[PDB]
Amino acid sequence: PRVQRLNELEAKTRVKLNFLDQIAKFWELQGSSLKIPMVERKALDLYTLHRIVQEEGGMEQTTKDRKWAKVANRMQYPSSKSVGATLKAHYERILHPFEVYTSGKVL
């Protein structure tokens, strides 16, 4: 378990969340904790949260705007600079090594 938050299986929409299992195959030999979105909200929905960040302006431009506070308001987090920085750093470490794929395949 190694319990930080309440989680076990978690995948409401399986085929859409399976996109997170595709990138999990990229982090399988790294051992790094992937598929950890709603670190506060206790559940895990990176798919819909990734659409939110994109409609705010994408992870890169929303970092320049520093609107990660307001991205946290969209799913009703306790909107802190710390909470926004947790989501920011988590996107930075995961998408920037994997953008070798998303460069030509911008989904």
Within a 13 Å sphere around the CA of 103, how many CA atoms are in the beta-carbon half? 6
Q: What ranges in the chain are assigned the alpha helix state H?
A: 14-27, 46-56, 59-65, 68-74, 81-102
CB 47 within 8 A of CB 13: yes
Chain-centre distance of CA 1, in angstroms?
21
**Could you give the angle at the alpha carbon of 55 between the alpha carbons of 41 and 15, nearest 5°?**
65
Residue listed under structure tokens 């920011």: 88
The token pair that represents 65 in the structure block: 């705007």
Please tell me the distance from the alpha carbon of residue 84 to that of residue 104, in angstroms, as a whole number: 28
**Closest by Cα among 46, 52, 51 to 11:** 46
Domain boundaries of the chain, sorted by first residue: 1-107
- Collapsed DSSP state (helix, strand, coil) of residue 42: coil
Rounded to whole angstroms, the Cα distance separating 34 from 61 reads: 22
Query: Is domain 1-107 in CATH 3.30.1490.190, yes or no?
Result: no
Q: CA torsion sign, 65 to 79 to 70 to 59?
A: positive
Experimental method: NMR
